[PDB]
Design a binder for this molecule. Structure first.
Ligand SMILES: *[C@@H]1O[C@H](CO)[C@@H](O)[C@H](O)[C@H]1NC(C)=O
Ligand SMILES: *[C@@H]1O[C@H](CO)[C@@H](O)[C@H](O)[C@H]1NC(C)=O
Ligand SMILES: *[C@@H]1O[C@H](CO)[C@@H](O)[C@H](O)[C@H]1NC(C)=O
Ligand SMILES: *[C@@H]1O[C@H](CO)[C@@H](O)[C@H](O)[C@H]1NC(C)=O
Lengths: 54, 307, 439
C-alpha cells in the first residue's frame, strides 16, 4: 500500500495495535503529524506498531 | 469555393450576426479577429458561417473569447499566410481565452502555417501538453522559443493527465442501457466526490467530448458498499440506434494540483436493441473539502507515537 | 474534585473510572476508540457539571446515548477549542441520541456533529437557545432527515419557532429540552423555572442565592459565583480565582495583571528580584518550516507572539467572524521572517486583524522566490494596507492571483506604499484575474 488516509487508516491501526491499545501522553511535544507521515508521503506498514502501547 | 475580400484589413467577428456575412466564404483575403464575449450555441452556427473558411491571408487573432471551449467550428483549416506577421513575427494569436479547452488539433486534421509564429497566454484551461502536439503538426516545430508561449498560466488549472476508467460490464435493452466501471481508487480515497456520465446520440464515430454542451449529463454517486463496483441504468433511449457514452471523474483539484489526478473513460459506442443543478460545484465539494481536512487534523492530533 | 490538567481516555471503558470523583475538569475531555463497545451502562458520572474546554468523542462504538454518562453536564466553557469547535461528536457508530439534557450554555465555540450513523434528534433542539452564533455550527452527514421520526413523549412538550419552524424541541424521546422561560430574560432559572442569580450559568439548586449556582458565568471563588475575582485573587484558567499558594506551586510560573500565567506577556519580563515580578518581546518558535494557520486552535498557539520566525500559510475555509479572534492572537505579530502565503481563505474579507504587522523579511521563499503570495481568496475584499499603516517587504517578489473581489487599484496602492514595483511582471500582479469581478 502506497498511502492510507481515511477510515481505512484508523482500521489498519486498530488491526495492527489490536487489543494492546493506543499510547497517549500530554503534548507537554513534537508538532509532526502522522498523516503527513503516512498519507501524503509514502507510508510504512511496519511503523504503525510504534503507536501502540508496549 | 469562393474568395472573399472584406473592407477592413481585419474582419472582426463579435457575434454570429457579424460572422454571417462570411457565410460561404472559403478563402478570406483579410485578417480575422474573434472577440466573442458571450452567447448561446454560437459555435454551432459559426461553423456554418465560417467552417468552409480554409485560407486566411492575414494573421488570425482570438481574444477575450471566453465563450469558446472548442475551435472545432473552423472545420477544415489549411493555411495562414503570415502576410501580417505580428510583433515578434506572429501570425496566430490567442490571448485571455478563459474557457478554451481544445484547439481543433486532433487526429482527424492537420494544418499548415505559411509563416509567422504562434502566441498563447492566459489560457488557463488549455493544457500546455496539448499545444506541443499542435505546434509540431503545424510544421512550426521549433520556430518558437521559451517566452513566446508561456508555461506559467496556460492550462494552469487543467487536468493535463487523466487516469483511464475501464468499462467492466455493459447491458442493453430495446430502450435501456445498464453499465458499470471499475472502482477507481484515487491516491487518497476522499479525493473523489462523484462520477459524471455523459451520453449523446452519435450515429457516426466522428465524435469528441467538446462537441458543445449537446452532451446529456448524468450525475452518479459511488454506492457506499466499498465491495461494489459502480454502475448506472440509462433508460428511455432511442431503439435501434447507436449512442455514445463516456465518463469523467470528479475530484478535488486542490492541495496538490496535478497530484490530484483526474480520471476519464475512453468513449464507448452502444447500439440499443431492436436534474443537473448549479451550485453542486461547491455545495457537494464543501462537504468533503471541509471534512477531509478536519479528519486529517483529528488524526494528526489524537494519535501520538510512543518514544 | 477539580481534576486536570486534562483528561484523555482511550482503549477501554474500564479506564473511564478515573472520572468517578471529578466534578469540574480544568481541561479538555477526550473519549476515544473504546472499541470493546461492551461495558456500556456499567458507568455513570453525575458529579461532572462543567468542562472548561472542548469535549471530543470518537468511535465510541458501544454507546447509545451520552445522557447515560453525563446527565448534568451543564456548561462547556470552551476556553480552549478544537478547530473552532468546543464540542465534537464524530463517527459514533452506535449513538442514537445525545442526551446531555441539562446542558444550558456553551460559552465560546461552535458544534461539529458529523457522520454519526444512527444519530436522531439532530437540530430538533434550538442551538440558538443553548449558544450564540448557530451559523458556525456544522452538523453534516448524519442519519438523513426523514429516517428518524424525532419525538418527545405525547408528541405535549416545550416548544419554539425552531428556526423558521414551530415545533416541540426534544433532546431524546424521554426528555424535553428543559428551558427557562422568557420572563427570566438574561437570567437562568432553577427547577420550577424560577429565575436565579444573574451570576449563575445553567441551573441552580435554590433561587437567587449566589451560593446556589451550579456554574459561574464569570468566575468561581470560595463556593460562590461572582462577576469578578475578589481583591488579591487572580483569574486562573479562565474560570477560577487563586493566590500565590497555588500559582507558586504549579509545576514548571508568573503573575501578571491579575492573571496567573505560564509566562510574562509582550512588554514584560522576569525580574529575578522576586519571581512574581513580570517587570515591564515574545518569540514564537518553529518546527515545521510551514506553520499553517487554519483555525482559532492553531492561531491560539500564537497568542501574544511578537516575532514569528517562520513561514505562514492561511487556509480559512469557513468561519463567520473569526478575524475578531485572530486579531486578539495574531495582531501583536510585528514580524514574519519567512515568506507568507495565503490560500483558499474564502472566509476572509480583510487582513485588518493583522494589526501590528510591520515586516516580511523573506528569509525563506516559495518556488519562484516569492516572499509573499495570494491565491484563490474568493472573499478577500480588502487588505489591511490602508496608508495609515506600513508594511515593509525587505526582499523578494510578490505574487497575486485569482483574488476576484480585490480591486486592482487596492493592490496597486499596496505596490505604492511598499514601493515595490521593480520586481513583478504583468502576471504576478495581473489585472487579468485579480479583481476581475470586484464591485
Ligand atoms: C460525421 O459523420 C456524419 C455522417 O454520419 C457527417 O454527416 C458529419 O458531417 C461528420 N462530421 C461531424 C462533425 O459530424
Ligand atoms: C475517589 O475518592 C474516594 C474518596 O477519597 C477514594 O476512596 C477513591 O479511591 C477515589 N477514586 C478515584 C478513582 O480517584
Ligand atoms: C452563555 O454564557 C455566555 C457568558 O459570557 C453568554 O455570553 C452567552 O450569551 C450565553 N448563552 C446562553 C444561551 O445562555
Ligand atoms: C531564489 O531562492 C533561492 C533560495 O532562497 C536562492 O538561492 C536564489 O538565489 C534565489 N534567486 C533566484 C533563484 O533567482
Amino acid at each position: 500500500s502506497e498511502t492510507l488516509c481515511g477510515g481505512e487508516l484508523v482500521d489498519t491501526l486498530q488491526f495492527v495495535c489490536g487489543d494492546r491499545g493506543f499510547y497517549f501522553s500530554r503534548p507537554a511535544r513534537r508538532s509532526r503529524g502522522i498523516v503527513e507521515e503516512c498519507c501524503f508521503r509514502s507510508c510504512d506498514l511496519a511503523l504503525l506498531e510504534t503507536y501502540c502501547a508496549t | 469555393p469562393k474568395v472573399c475580400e472584406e473592407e477592413k484589413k481585419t474582419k472582426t467577428i463579435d457575434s454570429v450576426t457579424s460572422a454571417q456575412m462570411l457565410q460561404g466564404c472559403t478563402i478570406f483575403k483579410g485578417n480575422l479577429l474573434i472577440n466573442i464575449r458571450r452567447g448561446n450555441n454560437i459555435a454551432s452556427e459559426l461553423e456554418n458561417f465560417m467552417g468552409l473558411i480554409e485560407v486566411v491571408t492575414g494573421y488570425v487573432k482570438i481574444r477575450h473569447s471566453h465563450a469558446l471551449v472548442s475551435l472545432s467550428f473552423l472545420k477544415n483549416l489549411r493555411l495562414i499566410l503570415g502576410e501580417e506577421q505580428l510583433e515578434g513575427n506572429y501570425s496566430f494569436y490567442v490571448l485571455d481565452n478563459q474557457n478554451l479547452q481544445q484547439l481543433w488539433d486532433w487526429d482527424h486534421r492537420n494544418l499548415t502555417i505559411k509563416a509567422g509564429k504562434m502566441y498563447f497566454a492566459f489560457n488557463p484551461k488549455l493544457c500546455v501538453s496539448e499545444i506541443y502536439r499542435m505546434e509540431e503538426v503545424t510544421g512550426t516545430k521549433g520556430r518558437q522559443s521559451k517566452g513566446d508561449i508561456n508555461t506559467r498560466n496556460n492550462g494552469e488549472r487543467a487536468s493535463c493527465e487523466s487516469d483511464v476508467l475501464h468499462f467492466t460490464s455493459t447491458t442493453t435493452s430495446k430502450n435501456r442501457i445498464i453499465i458499470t466501471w471499475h472502482r477507481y481508487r484515487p491516491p487518497d480515497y476522499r479525493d473523489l466526490i462523484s462520477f459524471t456520465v455523459y451520453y449523446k446520440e452519435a450515429p457516426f464515430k466522428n465524435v469528441t467530448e467538446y462537441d458543445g454542451q449537446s452532451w446529456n449529463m448524468v450525475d452518479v454517486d459511488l454506492p457506499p458498499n466499498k465491495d461494489v463496483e459502480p454502475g448506472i441504468l440509462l433508460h428511455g433511449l432511442k431503439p435501434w440506434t447507436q449512442y455514445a457514452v463516456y465518463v469523467k471523474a470528479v475530484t478535488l483539484t486542490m492541495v496538490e494540483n496535478d497530484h490530484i489526478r483526474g480520471a476519464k473513460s475512453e468513449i464507448l459506442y452502444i447500439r440499443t436493441n431492436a436534474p443537473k443543478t448549479e451550485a453542486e460545484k461547491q455545495a457537494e465539494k464543501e462537504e468533503a473539502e471541509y471534512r477531509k481536512v478536519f479528519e486529517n487534523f483529528l488524526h494528526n492530533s489524537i494519535f501520538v507515537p510512543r518514544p
